[model samples]
Structure formats: C-alpha cells, structure tokens
Target chain A: KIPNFVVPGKCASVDRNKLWAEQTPNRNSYAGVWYQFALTNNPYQLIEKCVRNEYSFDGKQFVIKSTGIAYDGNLLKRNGKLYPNPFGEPHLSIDYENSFAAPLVILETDYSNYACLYSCIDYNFGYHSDFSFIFSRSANLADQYVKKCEAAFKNINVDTTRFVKTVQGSSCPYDTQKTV
Target chain B: KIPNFVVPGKCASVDRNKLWAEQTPNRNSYAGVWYQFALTNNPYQLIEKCVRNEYSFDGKQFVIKSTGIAYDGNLLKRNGKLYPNPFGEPHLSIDYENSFAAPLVILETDYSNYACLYSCIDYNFGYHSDFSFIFSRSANLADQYVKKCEAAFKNINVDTTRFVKTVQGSSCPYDTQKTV
Candidate 1:
C-alpha cells in the first residue's frame, strides 16, 4: 500500500520539500537525484573505484553532464599505489560542476537496471560509512534487487548483507496513492 | 553492480576521511538526544510523534528511550494549542544512570517490537526530511510488521510509501548484521 508520489511530466521539485519546516531543514539531505550511468565492461572494478574515492555531493538541482568535470586519465592512487582498474570503459570522472550536493547519484551497470542511493554524513552521524541503495526501476524492489545488490558486493569481496543494515520504507514517495 | 568494503561492528569507529565512513562521530554535534515521555493512545500518532522527534543516529539508530536525557512534555505544539499524545503511555521523566549511547532502543508496544536505528546529519537527507528505522524487536520483521508500520504512518498522516525508498540498505547499523 505505497502511494505513487511521482507523476511523470511533473517538475521533479514539485513534491521536494513538503515535509520541511516542522523538521530539520536538512535531515535527509543526501537522499535523491541519482544519475544512472551505464557501465562499459569490467563494471565490478569500476564500481569499487567509485566507492573507494567516496563519490559524493551536496544536494541541489542541476544538470550533471553539463558540468565540466572530466577524468584526466590518471588513475586515483591510494598510498602511492595506483588502483588496479582493468575494467571496460574505465571509470569516467563525473562532470559535477564542483557542486557537493548532486542530490541522488544512481548507476546502471551491465548487471542491474535498478537504482542506487548514496548515504552521506558529516563527522557525526556515527562511525563513518557511506550508504548504498540497490533498487528496482519499478516500485517495490523484489528479492532480485536485493540479491543483485548483494551479488555486486560479492564481486567487490565484501559481504552484501553485512555491508548495510536493511530498513524498509516507501520508494517514490507514494508509488501510486494520494497523500492521505 | 556495487562494490562492498569492510563491515565493522556497531561499536566500531569509522574513519570519516575514508569513503563511506560508518556513522559520523562527534555524536553531540549534529543532533540532540531527547527521552520520549508522553505516550499517545493513538497508535498512529504514537508512531508519528515518536518518529517525529526521532532522528537517525546517522539516520540509522532511532534512540527511543534513554536515561539522563531531557524529555519534553508535549512532543509538538500545533496551531497555538498543546496536545498530549499518540503512543498512549503515561509521561515519565525517567533518568538513566548509564551512558546515553548504551541503551538499545526498541519499539515495544501492542503493535510490534522494533528497534529504532538512525543517524544524525547537519542537513536533512531528503526534501528537508530526516529518516529512521521503525525497527521490530527482533532481527526478523514480518509481513505484519511492514503492514503495521504502514498503518502507524497512515495514522500519523504521513505516507508510508514516502519512506520506503529501498529495502536493501534502509536498516540501521546496530540492528542489522551490517555494522561499519
């Protein structure tokens, strides 16, 4: 019984701030505006590079591709060792207009079509950790969405279930119902 | 596909400098802690009121009740009026002799036994909204658990669907096996 919050053709910002004022103006600040980028070949390593780099942004409305952000062909090195990236299409530097809050950054690899939401926090949310979301393109992601996300984690040599605590809530505001 | 990193314990210290630091440390900075006293008779409002005041530790741990923390008489005041409650329990100014961070906050009511896991952010996570886990007492949440939470939200006049962005990573670091 989730409600449909998205009505195509409606401006994305229409229902953006309905719950503000009563609550902290920036509580769920990093929860939306994910860009689904298509991966090339070695998608696994590419994803790891992104995570290790801590790809994050401040939330706000803007066009991503238009940003001048680009990759200089130099692989990001950790402790002087270049990251081992042998993936197809190699990781591309995001063209973020130097903006921190890009809202939601999503991805679509050779594997899954669902979306991902990143979790960001300052120096005090708890222990430092970024949140990742493996979602369905449709409302109510099935076991597969979870499994696929889990599988992707496996490729990176990490425990899928152990990597994140699973809390279930609504997706797409009200997937198909009116706000009561 | 997504990449996975190390999973630390709920009590582990996350390196914020690294990508995906666990919960942001400096617990006292972003948000404040409040002990819930007045319980509303309306299960719906109870959930709402409880949740309304409740914020994620990093948007993860929902600290339900704690000792030594201050409790507010009325959770919220609307339209120039003071109203008393949604979770029907009586209000008590209980003090805890232990540390405020130690108590494992759980949702124990006629509805379900759930834990609240949340994180604190200087800014809202979404649309000027914050988030939390309406945890069930045990690790296992039932279909009924989901339904009841849905109902509780409806009673509070909030859309349950708006919360369920993705079920895979919506859990708190404490409750679920994923800690870091």
Candidate 2:
C-alpha cells in the first residue's frame, strides 16, 4: 500500500482549523493544462521547469496528473503514482507512497485565467507546513492577478515572501493528450 | 562584506572535500543566453521557466547577470545584489547579501551545444549540498548532447537523479544585450 505521506521535508505540519477547499468547484473548468506561475517554498522541489498539472474527471473521481523534469534527466510524470483522486468539496487529498497524505484546496480560479492552490500537511511533529501555488492557463501571469493571489494568501495569513514564480515558456510545454 | 555561509535550510551540510570547479573555462564563448536544460536539486527554488543564464566577461572579470520570473508576476534579475564576479578558472563563486557565497563550476561546455554547471556550498552544518545544471544555447536540447551532459555528470560521480530539465521556448525570451 502506498504510504499516506506527502514526501519528507516538502510540507509543514497540518493546521486543520485553517484548512479550507473550494466549495462546489467546477471540475470541468479545472480540467486542462495549468502552467504553474508561482509556488510556495518546499524542500522536495518537485515542480520546477516545464511544470504543469493535468486534471481529468470521469464522472466518478478526478484524475490529477502532474508532469515535469524528473530526477533521472527524463521527462516523466511527477504525480499519479499516488492517489487517483483526492477530491473534496474544493480541496483534494493526496496520499503518496512514502509521505503522509495532504489536503489540496482550490481557493479560487477562473478556469481560463488563473488558480490558487493551498495545501497543508500535518507532519508527525506538531508544526503544519503549507504550500500555496498560483497557476494560469498561459505560461505567464499578469501582475494584477499575481497580486490578487498574493492578497488571497495574505487574507489566509499565509506568507508569500519566499514564494517562487515558476518559469513557463517554450522551455516547458504541456502535454494535453494524456488522461487518467 | 558578503558572508561565506550558505543560507540555512537552503542547502545541505558543507562537504568541501568533494568540491570541484571547472579548469580553464573559455570566457568568450561562455557569454550569451544559455537556456537551462537540467539542474541539480537545491532549496533555493528560483529560475524555473525558460531558465537561462547571461554572462559577460569584462577585461578584469566575467560579469554575471541571472534573471528569472519573480512570484510577483514580473521579470526580474534573480541575483545581482551580491559579488560582481565569482571568477575562478572555470568555476565562479557567488556571495549574495542574504545568502552564503556558493560555487558555480562549469563541468564542460561547447558554448553552442551544451554546458554543465556543478556547484556546492558549505552550509553552517557539517555536511555539504551540491547542485548541477545543464544548459544550452537553445531552449530544447538534442538527444545526443543531453546524453553527453549526463555522461559528464556520471564521470564526476554526481547523481543526476534529482536534476530538473528546464522548459524553454517562446514563453521565455532571452535578453541578449544586458551586461553587468
């Protein structure tokens, strides 16, 4: 069985009280390539170049596929080795093989322009580590929307100081055909 | 003065024994926008999309200017706030105001085809953390040269497993004229 973990040294401890997922999220609109614009600090550093997520719903569970540069120097799937769907109201849970499962919340999105993903993991230790990722359909994001996302995080009391804006362009391309 | 210490939680323990930099690196050919194709894992998660490095050699030292997308949705120079030149033979040291001085080595490079960067930092702790990056003049790399870089890393016994292949293309355009 896959360990219900989110990889070691990647996320913080969980704060269940502050955790919130999108309510009644439109799974249809969420489908397609989401180019990562920025990401919160994490140790694993999985999503870097050409990083994008593909989501598919089969009327049952949502299939999420994350792809990017792998440690082996080959283009490979980043996610999908774990849970098939972590679908919650707007939050999804991911139970990886080696790390504790974490909650992925969709704070807000336009389906066409941008999205804000918030996830927090409860480590064996007491502290909760969280991740906030801002993604857009296009490789580049507008400054206005970037501020909007930053504001959203601030409202939730999440720090954006160390957040990294992801590089997107011809260097990174999204694979559209693959589906779960 | 810049501190010699690498930032905490950004790199592993400092292992100076295994550290190596390039020997007699060609400065002239090294100038220009070299797109990052693969990179060793590091805690400082900057320069992701259409990642490229810009280098200019002055009569005195080679001026280095690195730029990337900031989380604020703006294109910005990643590192310029530190030492101007980290020039060694083929390796350079970068000492930032906020972070420790890090080593950037040119493992091998044809300038036109590909270049491999090997860097290591001595953290505050006892251990050492390292990073390797593969770069090219073009956003995408050919299979043959990619293999060449991989083989080069292997010769040094540096594990390329966590090396991330960067995305390139129209999404990232190189700023060819800028020099520090």
Candidate 3:
C-alpha cells in the first residue's frame, strides 16, 4: 500500500482526494515520444542524458516505456507494468523497472506541447519519495516552456531548484527510436 | 474583413457562430516541425511534397511558418500573418501569403503523434473553401493514427475520400531545415 503522507504536490487547501480532472478528453493524444526536459531533485542522478519516454494506448490501458543513458554510457530501458487505480481516480498506475507501482497525476498537459507529472511513493526506506517530471514533445524545449514547467512545480510547492535538465541532441548518440 | 460564409466545416446541426475550442493548452508544444501527412480534397493540388509547418512562441503570441514544394519542383514559402481571436475562442487565425485569415481548429492533437486541424475560408469564387490538414510530428504517422485522423474528418462532416498523402522522406531533400 502507498503511504498516506501529504501528497507530493498537494497543499493544505488543494483537494488531494480527487483525480486530476482538468485533463483533455483526448487521452489517445498522450501516446508517442516525450523527451525528458527536466526531473525533480532526487537521489537518482544516473538516469540522465538522452532521456525519453514513449507511451501507447491499447484501448483499455496505457503502456509506458522509457529510455535513458546510464552513467557508464550504456543505454537503459524500463518497461512499466500497468495496474488498476484503486482510488477511483483518473490517475495512471505504473510499476516501472525500479520505481514500483505509483499513481501518476496528470497535473497539466497540452497533449502536443508539454506535460507535468506528479507522484509520490514509499520506497521501503521508511520515507515517502516524491517525483515530478517535465516532458516535452521535442528533445529541446524552448525557454518559455521550461519556465512554465518550473512555475507549475512551484505552484505545487515542489522545489524548482532541484530540477536537472536532461542532455539530448548530438552529445548523446542513441536517440533513434528513443535509443541508440 | 473576413467573409462570413457558412464557415466550411459547419453543417445544419453544427455551431458556426464561434471559433473551434477543441484544442489542448500546450501551445508551446505546437512549436516544431510538423509534416503534413494528409489533406482533405481541395481544388489546390500544387502544394504537396515536403509540406511542413514550423511554430515558435514568444512570451506573447505564437509565430507560424510553412514550406512546401510546387508541382513544377519549385520551392514555395508562405508567410502567415497572425490575427486575433475576438470571440475568445481557442483557435489560430493565419493569413497566408495567398489565402486569407483561416481559422485553424485543433480538432485533436497528441503533440508527438498526430494532430488534426480544420479550417474554412473563401477563394473569392462566391463559394466557401474548406481545409483539413493531418499533421504528424514524424515524417510518417502510424496507420492507426492515419485512420484516426480520417475518422475525425468524417465526424466533422468533412469528406476524406479526396484526402491525399503528401510525399515526405528521402525523395524530398532539406526536410531537416524545413527547406528544399
């Protein structure tokens, strides 16, 4: 079971019980490649550079796959397993290769531009871990978008100072199909 | 002033008084190279092959540009002027070098996968001109997405039987720079 600790992006006034309902009805629009523009401050620093996430909808569920470059310059792939949303929320449940099942709230998305994802999980460390990722449709997002994403995080009380930008473009070679 | 014809995509049951509002809020996401995967049947056929639309947003409005190949193998560039949405509708008014300000409705967009845009105008023939463009973030969109685009047209009462696929890829050079 997930921890009931204060939700990551939830402040005292915000409703933590409701599934983020501001999402567009075009859920299928979420399917495709998303380059990781930024990641919230966390212990995991190895998963950086050429970071990308691919998603697909199977009419019944959404499949999420991610690719990243390891510290040793090796490519890493993570396939997330789909789970049911027990909280009757519209959130997505994905048990990634390392992170286990976590309910991801779609804080905001333009389906074609950028998306902000928020989630909190208990990693068996006697503490709850919080995560927020900024995803863009292209490998390089414009500065305005980056600022908008930063503001979204700040609105949720998340520290933008801990954000790290992912390296993309020629510096990393394995970007074909979100991999080398 | 723009002509007030029936606004091409409108029928007896559809609303014709307001601009389309089916778009997602990720405006910056639309700022990238979008390949014209398909087009609705229209009298104009010369604007084909390597058709691409590039967008960039400043702090205020979005900047739009486009490139295409003429039937005689000549490169064509059209500078589209941005117009205001007085009705408070979430749409884009682009007055191309040749065409008047056409209201582009974001019927649907996955941002990274596919986007369907609908518009209506008049070519001064005393008849309404209608346009529907299927855009893909990639050179080629998956068959399923193509079908989805076709269905979107059908739902809007726009005939897709005359839809033609634009030639992209190696046959067209300089797609990388949105050029010839």
Candidate 4:
C-alpha cells in the first residue's frame, strides 16, 4: 500500500505525511516521514484530481467561440455539470504546460475580464517556502487576499513571509515560464 | 591590519570591491592600505558615477522621464522635484524604513497604473525569490522586460532563470501603504 500524495504546494500534499504525525498526539517524532494512513490512499488518483481541479486559462483572456470555458467569477458550470468551480473550491489546479506557455492565470484577475484570480506556487518544486496566491476580480485586491494567501500557506505548514506580493505595471514582466 | 573578509549572497558587492583593488593594486597586504589617489577621488564615487553616466533607459517604445532615470520606469527623481522639471540628478536610493514614507523620492508612472490599482506581490520584500524586476512606461519594451530582467541579472553573475519576472496582477501589498 503506497502512500497517497497531494500536490506539492497545496495543503493536501503527500509530503505533509509528517505534519499529520506531528499534529497527532502520539508522535512529535514523526516530523519528516509520511503518515501510514496517507500512504494507504491512492496517491496517483489524488494527484491527478488536483491537476484536473486546478484552474487555468487560454492565452487570451476573453472567452469567445475559442471552444474554451470562460471563468465568470465561477468555475465552468452549466448543463447540470457544475464544474466544481475553482471560485468555490479551495485551490484551483493549473495546467503547468499552459501556464508556462502564458501566464494565463494572471489574465483571470487583470482588469480585462473576470477581475479576481488566485494561484499557488508549488513547494515540491523546491524549498518548502513555495506558495500560491488568490486574486480578486479587481486588478487591485482587498487587504484580505494577503491574509488569504497566508492562511493557505499556513494550512500547508509553509512559510508565509517567504511569500511576497508583487508590484504590477507595464514595467512588471509576466513570469510565463519557470526560472528553474 | 585586517584580513580579506567577505560574505555570501554578496558576490556583486565583493566583485565591485575587487575591481577597485585592481585599479589601485593594494601594495600593503595588511595595516592601513591607502591608495595614492586623492581622498576626494574615491572609487565608490567612480562606480556610482559610471553607473549613472552610462545609464540607459533607452528604447523607442519606452521614454525616460524628463530626467532619464528609470527604476522599472518609476523615474528615480530627487526629493521635492517634479518630472519634466526635475531639479537634481536622477538616482535610486532604498530606505526600507522611510520608503513608502514621506519626504522620499516619489515618481509615479502612468503606464499600467490601472493594474497597480490592485495589490501586487512585492517580491523584493516577500522573500519569494532573489529575482528582481525592470519597469518602463511604454509596453514597447526593449528585447522584452522578461529578457531584460534576465540579462540585468546575468550581468550581475546571477542565474537569471533562478528569478522569474513578476506576474502582472500577482501581488504588491505594500505599494498601497499610502506613501506614509
């Protein structure tokens, strides 16, 4: 029975195997190992679920007849197939391929269309310091977004200060690709 | 009578110091080593002057403020001066305590101001990554902002990719602090 793993950055990640144990009364010693129960679940399926559930966008922001879904403040919902909208869900899974090609998630919050947006930077990519962000429909967000991102990171036991909000302007470059 | 002392995460600083040493060739290994040059003709002044004189915010797409100063196109004008009618030489200074404070150099760029209307991720403060940014007024950037940031970083001997460009609408919480 292999351990079920979660996304690298989300709170429900496999590496959290340690947190589960630490949170449990029996063992503060289990600080770095995966929990037996987490391992018992289907790690592969869980991961795939995260990947599928994560939110993303096409290169262009507007949703036209491009055959893609438009995020109207809610996840793709229609025809009785409530897409479990990322807006409602805790974290949205992003297609790494598409994001790297174009910072599509960025468009979701910009003034162009659906103003609000959110993103999570994966920790598994590197140090446990990695993070994700949640954006509002406004290009500018309420002070709450900072708290929101911090809360999300804390839920996963990641460092918050390590997470920084960025300044934007025509001068700001869109990180469409991963540096590492 | 001190030994060669250096620190980590400070290669650029050390390299610059070394360049100064080469120009003067410190003959004395220990004890107070003074160059034959005049006290006023300091190397620090030379480096600063060089950096300023060769300063290039040059690009047809992006125009420098009346004073040719550009920190991501914010135009690092001097205190109490207005753009197009700047009184002093352009220079960028960082004062964490006073910055976002009053009586500090403040030059606002209209480009993408709509975006800045929202909170952005200030990577500089958030410890997200060591990667920095470059700003300009016009979207008609040189080579490209991303590429430029990468090149600027590489010039400093850092792995450019290690730092990614700031995603538009990502986050910059402190920028909205009301410039206290």
Candidate 5:
C-alpha cells in the first residue's frame, strides 16, 4: 500500500482559474504569504508551529488563510473524487465524515523561489497519517534551494528525513497592508 | 508502497487549460469522440481492441487522435513535477528516456455522457504497468453510467474486479467532421 507520501506518477499542470481566479503565472499562484517553512509527519492542521501563511483566491475560493493555525482551520478541499493538483488541492476535514482525504501533492515549485507540499491519510476512521511542506518566499531557504526540496521528495520514492524545518519567526505577527 | 492501481487518496480536479485550452466546464472538457469503453489491467497503449477514440483540442494542444492505435503512439504527458488532473494529463513516452510517467486521472466526468480514466506506471526503465479507462459518449454504456464508473473506482479504494468491459463494434471506421 503506497503512502509514504504519494508522488508515484505525480500530477500538476494546474490552471484552476489560474490557480485561484484569473491572473496566472508565478508557478500557478498560491497567492502570497508563505514561510510556513518545511514539515512532514502528521502535520494534520498544518502550520507547523505557526509562521504566518495566507492564500486567498479572492473570489475563486481556495482559501487557507491562517490566523496562526486553528488546527489548520477545519481544513477542507475534497470534492469527493479529485486529486488534481497543479499547485495543490484535495485536502480534507471541512465537513469530516469520519475522515480520510489528502492529496495536496505538488512535489516542487516554480511559484517564485520555493514550494513543495505533500500529504497522506490512511486508516482514518481506520489512520496512518503523513504530511509534507516547504513553503518559502523568504524565511531562509538557501542550500541549493534546500536541495531542490528534498530532490522533489526523492524524485517520488519519498522520505525527506521526515522533512521538519520550520520557524520564520522574528517575533511573528504579519501584516503588510489590509488583505490577509 | 501503494500500487493496487493507486486510489489511496485519489487525485483529479483537472482544468488543464480547461482540459486542454479554453472551454472549461462540461466537467472540464476532453473535446470529443469516445468509446474506448471500460478497462483496467495493463491496458497500456490503450484502445483495447480498438473501438475508436478521438480527442483533439485544436490550437491549444491535447491531442490523442489515435489512428486506430500504434501502441498508443509513443504516449507522453510528463512535465516533471505535475500530477494535476482535472480531466486528464500526465502521460509518457513522447520522447522516452527509459521512462515512467503516468497520471492521467479523471475519476468521474460531466463532459456529456461517460468518462473515467486512470493510469499506473512503476518499475520503470525497469517496469510495472497498469491503466484504466471507460470512455463512452455512446457505443452502449447504460448500466447506470457503468455504475457511475466503477462507483468512482470503489470510491477511491480502487478495485472493480479488474474493471474489464469493452467492444462497441459495429465494425469500426469513423468520421463525422475532419477534426479527429
């Protein structure tokens, strides 16, 4: 049973209204405010110890804005049978029918300097648990782009030393203007 | 690793430029002509028994015209780190480099009548093969939409008794317009 954080024949070519409502490019828009740094292993309500993360599609809907993490805010992104990620989609627990929905795979990024994400959800109502991430637009991410994000998750075999590496902290509390 | 024909947290929320250029919605567009009806199990160069299948996207590119199948014409759909499928994308061999690239997922449809496709590739330059399909805009497919395409692949646990069922023959040789 494959679940070391799926990448087996990865998929991403996104353009979901240009990665959340028109205006494309930037490696398929995640809309800004990243630095939730790296992580993996049961990152359930992701935000890995808070580091400011925001993403809103304005009106196209794909919000995952975090007020520093509320268990990752009810998390939800499943539309039943969908795991079509170009940059991300297929999260779960917004409604939670007892659980199991994870396929946010992105494996690498072109959204300007850094982004890598993955997910796993097995045994839910039954539970295996696994997760991944490496968002960065700044908050330190140099080391050959963190070895190109763990060689894009070992090119799909997965196992980035359990990933972990968060904290873009300098005394959190983000705000640049007036939009999340 | 999970490979009973991957379904563990399935992924398919496609929109690849509207499944290959503008015109989104119709469950994300896949162009036209279908009936490669039901399959699973090493259905590689697909077209199992050649029933007739065509899908072009004009000027936007996403063609799979199929001149009756030539081992599926050196297939191809890998863009490196991409597994974002809304209506299919992530095939391989267009330039074969001792390959492994499959992720044409589409676990349901709305492009008119019926559609369900899947793919599996492992072992690689070294190999293990698997594929799935159930296209049908006719050529008989009314058993409750083929049981809603294997109940969306057993609601993502994947397993449809090896999902086999083809033959829409009335003696092939098709043409209606001039656009494949």
Candidate 6:
C-alpha cells in the first residue's frame, strides 16, 4: 500500500514489508548526515550523493532532505511500517520523496550509523520496479556494513546485482549537510 | 537486438520495434534546439529540459548536448532502429543515454519541428520501463504536434498516462544551446 502518485513531483512506489520495519527508530531521532552507498530502482541519482532523514522542529516533524534530496514532511510512526502523511513538495530536496509515503517500510536501521531501505510497486506479473538503498553516516560505507546491507536485499530474493553504487567523495557535487 | 550494460554509467533498456524507423533522418542532420514535452519510463529528469540531437563535427558526428542532457556518442543507423556504438559515457546526460542505445527507435519525426521516440527495455513480463519522448524544435511543442507524439505511444499499446510532460522554459535549469 505504499502510495503511487502524489502532488507536486507526482510519482509512485510499490510496497514491500516485514518485521524489519519494526526495528526502525520511531520519528527519526538521529543527528547525523547520511550518504547512500548503493541504491536500486531509483532514477533520480542526485539524492544518493547525500541525504538527511532525521527528526526536526523539536520532534514534531521529520526531514528527508539534503543537497540533492530535499523535503520536510508530516510524520507517522509504527512498529514495522510507517504510513507517513507526506503528500508531495517532493525528493532530489527530497522532492523525489513525492513517490514515497504511506506504507513506507524501514527495513533496517540502528538510529545511527546505517540504514537499509526497500520500496516497491507491483503489478500482477511482477514488480514494476523496487527502490532500495544502503546508507551510511559518512560518505563511504565500510565493506562489512555494505555486505550486511546487501544481505538485506538478498534475503528478500531481490536481485542484488541491481544495486548500483551511489557516488560519495570530495569530487562529488552535492552537499552533505547535517542540519535540519 | 539492442545493446545494454555498458561502462561508466551502466544501465539497460528493453527493445520494441516497427517500420517507421525508415524515416528518422540518419545521423541527426539538423540545426535546432529541441525540448521534450513528454516522456515515459525515465529515472533521470535533468536532460529533459533541452537536448541537441543533431549532427555536428562538420557533419562527421552527431551532437546530443544540453545542460541537463549532456554527451555526444558514436552514432550508428539503420532503417527503423539504431544500434549506437556508444558505451559508458552516460544521461541527465547524456549519461541517461546510457540506459538508451542499441535498440533505440524513432517512431516518427518530421526532421525539423517534431520527433516522437520510443525505447524499451524488456526481460519478459513486459517492459521494465520503456523510455519514450515527444520532442520539439522549440521550448514547447504545439498541442497538435504534441498529440501526434502521444498517438505514437498509444499506437503501440504503451500506457499513455505513463507519459509525463517534460519541463521547458527560461526557468528550466539546463542549457539549451542551438550550437552543435
């Protein structure tokens, strides 16, 4: 039930879930920058350079923004999944986030360090496409953490080869800000 | 068959075909700045603002450059489909052209004002995502021509609603130079 098609940047995403969502921190209470190391089923490449998915506005709001990805949206929380109230104002300022919302599942996260996410859109034959990511607190994720994140997709039987390395380094163009 | 999975910006596309390809002016022989009005099955948005899909290098090569859509690759041609010899150097490019190539098809084009393009990447269940566009010689194509482009997609049974209008105008961030 992940939303497909919303306001502004109107787009959609498929739904994929499980107990993994239960481990995600409620309300994004972190205080660090996130740089994605790999992503799948994504067309907007700029956001992977950097992202900020954390709590803000004194915990009343949640931010999913950064230089390439930007947006601040209404928060919704739950044990394994979040039915966010976000409806556009979209990601890349997180405008691409327009394609994401409701039924948003957090596959894995420690409230710090790393997070692995997967979102999908399916039709009877199979998935139209699926969105997944392996993010780190720093620009480059270590191989160990990277493998664990890869494991997440593998466990789900999603094609791990579809994972494309997200670019992160001094030569990269987007900002990796830590502010809300 | 079309080419897929090349270097630098590796991506793939499903192929679709027809006889209309016989008319696409070989080697992009033109001298106009083109802007896209609609597109289907694309992940990157930057290159859409403007494109230079024309001939350059004193007519020995083709020019496909614009601010968001950048890159000039080795070109090849045949009746209805093109098996472009380009690889790696990828779109938002012209890097996105990475997802393109090999089986690229030009469904219709008047050689001067409007061109309708349809490209697909398939593995069986149906297109993973088929990339198509209705391009104009100017910032915005007239509704008449726009509808004609839409007709091209509809004729193939490809979902017309999947076609999203491309952004064009002075407010657009990409450079739409008329120079080859």
The prediction achieving the highest lDDT against the true structure is 3
Q: What is the TM-score of chain A in candidate 2?
A: 0.72
Task: Rank candidates by lDDT, best first.
Answer: 3, 2, 5, 6, 1, 4
Model 2 alpha-carbon miss at residue B99, Å: 34
- Summarize candidate 5's per-residue lDDT along B65-127 as a digit string, tens digits: 443423333222212222233223333112111122245556567678887775543331222
Question: What clash count does candidate 3 reach?
Answer: 5
lDDT of 2: 0.57
Which candidate has the highest TM-score of all?
3
- What are the chain A TM-scores for all the models, listed individually? 0.30, 0.72, 0.77, 0.29, 0.25, 0.60
- The candidates, ranked best first by TM-score, are 3, 2, 6, 5, 1, 4
- lDDT per residue as tens, model 3, B46-165: 355788777777745566677777656788765554544423445555544322234557776788899987776432123355668889998889999988888877886776776778
Candidate 4 residue A90 Cα shift, in angstroms, is: 10
Q: List, for all models, the DockQ compared with the true complex.
A: 0.01, 0.01, 0.01, 0.01, 0.05, 0.02
lDDT of each: 0.26, 0.57, 0.62, 0.23, 0.49, 0.46
* Candidate 2 local lDDT, A1-180, one digit each (tens): 322223345443334334333333456666767778888765444445667777776754456677776544456564432122222223355432112234566666677898877776433223345668899888899988888888877876676785887767876545531331
Per-residue CA lDDT of model 5 for A59-132, tens digit only, reads: 43344445443333332221222223322333311211112223454556767778777554333122234466
- Cα lDDT tens digits, model 1, B4-42, are 111112222212233112223422232332223222121
The fnat score for candidate 1 comes to 0.00
Docking class of 1: incorrect
As a whole number from 0 to 100, the lDDT of residue A125 in candidate 3 is 21
* Per-chain TM-score of candidate 4, chain B: 0.26
Clashes of each: 92, 31, 5, 30, 25, 30
Model 6 chain A TM-score equals 0.60
**TM per prediction:** 0.21, 0.41, 0.42, 0.20, 0.27, 0.37
Worst-scoring 10-residue span by lDDT in model 4 chain A: A43-52
